[PDB]
């Protein structure tokens, strides 16, 4: 509980239990200000595209966390220790944490 | 020096023989013991069951380690299998030093 007190530790271990593997992974992030806080609407009129590449949408000042790749959780060693002696895997539960926030 | 486990009390030697079944003795007595036996032999099955204590790796190595893989290629004869006429062959010696750890 800040200011001079850290609100989380660096957990990045990977414990291989018996019929399961728990992979933890801490990263340092950086978040800018997007659109100068605006909801700018985006489309394909200004681009001059083909019929196939037309779009209509909205860009936001919000960021998003994504951890949707397998190397975000598995090291190359833990991947090798996964693919070579397992006939399958599936995720059971995740556990997200966001800590040590510094606004500059 | 050949490798292996030095044991003061090793697994004991199991020794086996056929009991001598003699042929017909003569009618009168003779103390020159026996040269005439019934030519025989035995067969059977034998099963040995050793339990081995493993030591798991506790490695914090990052990159993949060196393994014993079989060469996936178009092969005429699979390694460590029988031949076209049933001869079991072992194509190469396999050690046991593949994993690594710091000194």
GROMACS .gro file of C-alpha atoms in nm:
model
  207
    1UNK     CA    1   0.000   0.000   0.000
    2UNK     CA    2   0.193   0.297  -0.143
    3UNK     CA    3   0.353   0.548  -0.172
    4UNK     CA    4   0.671   0.403  -0.024
    5UNK     CA    5   0.540   0.047  -0.015
    6UNK     CA    6   0.523  -0.205  -0.299
    7UNK     CA    7   0.183  -0.356  -0.379
    8UNK     CA    8   0.301  -0.687  -0.524
    9UNK     CA    9   0.609  -0.898  -0.587
   10UNK     CA   10   0.766  -1.039  -0.905
   11UNK     CA   11   0.625  -1.388  -0.953
   12UNK     CA   12   0.751  -1.560  -1.265
   13UNK     CA   13   0.807  -1.924  -1.160
   14UNK     CA   14   0.671  -2.242  -1.320
   15UNK     CA   15   0.587  -2.529  -1.085
   16UNK     CA   16   0.530  -2.862  -1.259
   17UNK     CA   17   0.303  -3.064  -1.034
   18UNK     CA   18   0.188  -3.418  -1.107
   19UNK     CA   19  -0.098  -3.400  -1.356
   20UNK     CA   20  -0.079  -3.023  -1.396
   21UNK     CA   21   0.158  -2.731  -1.459
   22UNK     CA   22   0.111  -2.385  -1.307
   23UNK     CA   23   0.287  -2.116  -1.508
   24UNK     CA   24   0.330  -1.766  -1.364
   25UNK     CA   25   0.462  -1.471  -1.563
   26UNK     CA   26   0.526  -1.112  -1.456
   27UNK     CA   27   0.594  -0.834  -1.707
   28UNK     CA   28   0.658  -0.461  -1.684
   29UNK     CA   29   0.414  -0.258  -1.893
   30UNK     CA   30   0.379   0.098  -2.019
   31UNK     CA   31   0.053   0.269  -2.112
   32UNK     CA   32   0.041   0.595  -2.309
   33UNK     CA   33  -0.251   0.827  -2.364
   34UNK     CA   34  -0.437   0.730  -2.680
   35UNK     CA   35  -0.645   0.960  -2.904
   36UNK     CA   36  -0.580   1.243  -2.653
   37UNK     CA   37  -0.866   1.094  -2.444
   38UNK     CA   38  -1.112   1.087  -2.736
   39UNK     CA   39  -1.350   0.841  -2.896
   40UNK     CA   40  -1.238   0.892  -3.255
   41UNK     CA   41  -1.451   0.707  -3.508
   42UNK     CA   42  -1.257   0.530  -3.779
   43UNK     CA   43  -1.367   0.423  -4.124
   44UNK     CA   44  -1.229   0.353  -4.468
   45UNK     CA   45  -1.335   0.675  -4.643
   46UNK     CA   46  -1.009   0.862  -4.584
   47UNK     CA   47  -0.799   0.559  -4.679
   48UNK     CA   48  -0.924   0.497  -5.032
   49UNK     CA   49  -0.947   0.119  -5.011
   50UNK     CA   50  -1.100  -0.162  -5.214
   51UNK     CA   51  -1.450  -0.299  -5.155
   52UNK     CA   52  -1.306  -0.586  -4.952
   53UNK     CA   53  -1.103  -0.369  -4.716
   54UNK     CA   54  -1.376  -0.122  -4.618
   55UNK     CA   55  -1.453  -0.091  -4.248
   56UNK     CA   56  -1.638   0.129  -4.001
   57UNK     CA   57  -1.540   0.143  -3.639
   58UNK     CA   58  -1.444   0.333  -3.328
   59UNK     CA   59  -1.104   0.377  -3.164
   60UNK     CA   60  -1.095   0.437  -2.788
   61UNK     CA   61  -0.846   0.591  -2.541
   62UNK     CA   62  -0.848   0.258  -2.355
   63UNK     CA   63  -0.572   0.003  -2.358
   64UNK     CA   64  -0.609  -0.370  -2.313
   65UNK     CA   65  -0.397  -0.647  -2.168
   66UNK     CA   66  -0.356  -0.953  -2.387
   67UNK     CA   67  -0.169  -1.270  -2.293
   68UNK     CA   68  -0.303  -1.485  -2.577
   69UNK     CA   69   0.022  -1.647  -2.695
   70UNK     CA   70   0.183  -1.958  -2.554
   71UNK     CA   71   0.525  -1.802  -2.489
   72UNK     CA   72   0.364  -1.550  -2.256
   73UNK     CA   73   0.337  -1.837  -2.006
   74UNK     CA   74   0.579  -2.110  -2.118
   75UNK     CA   75   0.954  -2.074  -2.145
   76UNK     CA   76   1.122  -2.267  -2.429
   77UNK     CA   77   1.236  -2.522  -2.170
   78UNK     CA   78   0.890  -2.556  -2.015
   79UNK     CA   79   0.747  -2.592  -2.364
   80UNK     CA   80   0.991  -2.876  -2.437
   81UNK     CA   81   0.909  -3.031  -2.101
   82UNK     CA   82   0.541  -3.007  -2.208
   83UNK     CA   83   0.539  -3.130  -2.568
   84UNK     CA   84   0.767  -3.431  -2.522
   85UNK     CA   85   0.599  -3.626  -2.245
   86UNK     CA   86   0.233  -3.523  -2.257
   87UNK     CA   87  -0.048  -3.640  -2.484
   88UNK     CA   88  -0.248  -3.326  -2.414
   89UNK     CA   89  -0.302  -3.011  -2.216
   90UNK     CA   90  -0.581  -2.764  -2.144
   91UNK     CA   91  -0.606  -2.460  -1.916
   92UNK     CA   92  -0.805  -2.492  -1.596
   93UNK     CA   93  -0.798  -2.149  -1.435
   94UNK     CA   94  -0.609  -1.822  -1.461
   95UNK     CA   95  -0.535  -1.560  -1.199
   96UNK     CA   96  -0.465  -1.202  -1.305
   97UNK     CA   97  -0.287  -0.934  -1.104
   98UNK     CA   98  -0.192  -0.572  -1.175
   99UNK     CA   99   0.037  -0.402  -0.929
  100UNK     CA  100   0.308  -0.142  -0.851
  101UNK     CA  101   0.142   0.135  -1.050
  102UNK     CA  102   0.344   0.446  -1.135
  103UNK     CA  103   0.175   0.737  -1.311
  104UNK     CA  104   0.434   0.967  -1.465
  105UNK     CA  105   3.605  -4.955  -1.371
  106UNK     CA  106   3.350  -5.098  -1.615
  107UNK     CA  107   3.089  -4.863  -1.472
  108UNK     CA  108   2.803  -4.958  -1.244
  109UNK     CA  109   2.730  -4.996  -0.876
  110UNK     CA  110   2.998  -5.129  -0.645
  111UNK     CA  111   2.833  -5.355  -0.389
  112UNK     CA  112   2.988  -5.517  -0.083
  113UNK     CA  113   2.693  -5.757  -0.063
  114UNK     CA  114   2.582  -5.783  -0.427
  115UNK     CA  115   2.284  -5.983  -0.555
  116UNK     CA  116   2.373  -6.340  -0.464
  117UNK     CA  117   2.450  -6.601  -0.725
  118UNK     CA  118   2.161  -6.834  -0.802
  119UNK     CA  119   2.305  -7.169  -0.904
  120UNK     CA  120   2.108  -7.444  -1.073
  121UNK     CA  121   2.179  -7.795  -1.199
  122UNK     CA  122   1.999  -8.105  -1.316
  123UNK     CA  123   1.986  -8.376  -1.050
  124UNK     CA  124   2.173  -8.681  -1.183
  125UNK     CA  125   1.933  -8.963  -1.265
  126UNK     CA  126   2.150  -9.270  -1.337
  127UNK     CA  127   2.081  -9.546  -1.586
  128UNK     CA  128   2.046  -9.914  -1.500
  129UNK     CA  129   2.300 -10.037  -1.246
  130UNK     CA  130   2.436 -10.391  -1.289
  131UNK     CA  131   2.301 -10.696  -1.108
  132UNK     CA  132   2.594 -10.729  -0.868
  133UNK     CA  133   2.756 -10.455  -0.664
  134UNK     CA  134   3.039 -10.231  -0.781
  135UNK     CA  135   3.176  -9.932  -0.587
  136UNK     CA  136   3.323  -9.752  -0.890
  137UNK     CA  137   3.042  -9.509  -0.868
  138UNK     CA  138   2.867  -9.398  -1.192
  139UNK     CA  139   2.951  -9.311  -1.549
  140UNK     CA  140   2.609  -9.404  -1.690
  141UNK     CA  141   2.345  -9.136  -1.649
  142UNK     CA  142   2.022  -9.060  -1.830
  143UNK     CA  143   2.091  -8.781  -2.078
  144UNK     CA  144   1.846  -8.507  -1.985
  145UNK     CA  145   1.804  -8.131  -1.951
  146UNK     CA  146   1.553  -7.889  -1.806
  147UNK     CA  147   1.372  -7.578  -1.922
  148UNK     CA  148   1.144  -7.327  -1.757
  149UNK     CA  149   1.081  -6.960  -1.703
  150UNK     CA  150   1.264  -6.704  -1.491
  151UNK     CA  151   1.143  -6.358  -1.387
  152UNK     CA  152   1.355  -6.087  -1.224
  153UNK     CA  153   1.196  -5.773  -1.081
  154UNK     CA  154   1.423  -5.486  -0.978
  155UNK     CA  155   1.282  -5.169  -0.821
  156UNK     CA  156   1.490  -4.860  -0.898
  157UNK     CA  157   1.496  -4.529  -0.708
  158UNK     CA  158   1.490  -4.233  -0.946
  159UNK     CA  159   1.636  -3.888  -0.889
  160UNK     CA  160   1.432  -3.614  -1.054
  161UNK     CA  161   1.598  -3.318  -1.218
  162UNK     CA  162   1.560  -2.985  -1.041
  163UNK     CA  163   1.697  -2.790  -1.336
  164UNK     CA  164   1.647  -2.417  -1.385
  165UNK     CA  165   1.798  -2.426  -1.733
  166UNK     CA  166   1.619  -2.208  -1.986
  167UNK     CA  167   1.698  -2.348  -2.332
  168UNK     CA  168   1.609  -2.707  -2.433
  169UNK     CA  169   1.838  -2.987  -2.324
  170UNK     CA  170   1.997  -3.267  -2.526
  171UNK     CA  171   1.779  -3.577  -2.557
  172UNK     CA  172   1.803  -3.928  -2.694
  173UNK     CA  173   1.586  -3.911  -3.004
  174UNK     CA  174   1.539  -4.158  -3.287
  175UNK     CA  175   1.614  -4.032  -3.636
  176UNK     CA  176   1.280  -3.978  -3.808
  177UNK     CA  177   1.375  -4.064  -4.165
  178UNK     CA  178   1.278  -4.311  -4.435
  179UNK     CA  179   1.448  -4.616  -4.286
  180UNK     CA  180   1.480  -4.973  -4.407
  181UNK     CA  181   1.501  -5.118  -4.055
  182UNK     CA  182   1.373  -4.956  -3.735
  183UNK     CA  183   1.634  -4.920  -3.458
  184UNK     CA  184   1.603  -5.167  -3.167
  185UNK     CA  185   1.352  -5.392  -3.344
  186UNK     CA  186   1.374  -5.732  -3.514
  187UNK     CA  187   1.489  -5.797  -3.871
  188UNK     CA  188   1.316  -5.956  -4.170
  189UNK     CA  189   1.384  -6.297  -4.012
  190UNK     CA  190   1.347  -6.217  -3.645
  191UNK     CA  191   1.699  -6.129  -3.528
  192UNK     CA  192   1.685  -5.863  -3.257
  193UNK     CA  193   1.962  -5.608  -3.304
  194UNK     CA  194   2.083  -5.305  -3.108
  195UNK     CA  195   2.234  -5.052  -3.351
  196UNK     CA  196   2.433  -4.830  -3.112
  197UNK     CA  197   2.527  -4.803  -2.744
  198UNK     CA  198   2.316  -4.566  -2.537
  199UNK     CA  199   2.474  -4.398  -2.237
  200UNK     CA  200   2.283  -4.208  -1.972
  201UNK     CA  201   2.451  -3.867  -1.958
  202UNK     CA  202   2.211  -3.639  -2.145
  203UNK     CA  203   2.072  -3.394  -1.891
  204UNK     CA  204   2.292  -3.116  -1.761
  205UNK     CA  205   2.348  -2.943  -1.428
  206UNK     CA  206   2.608  -2.690  -1.310
  207UNK     CA  207   2.928  -2.819  -1.155
   0.00000   0.00000   0.00000
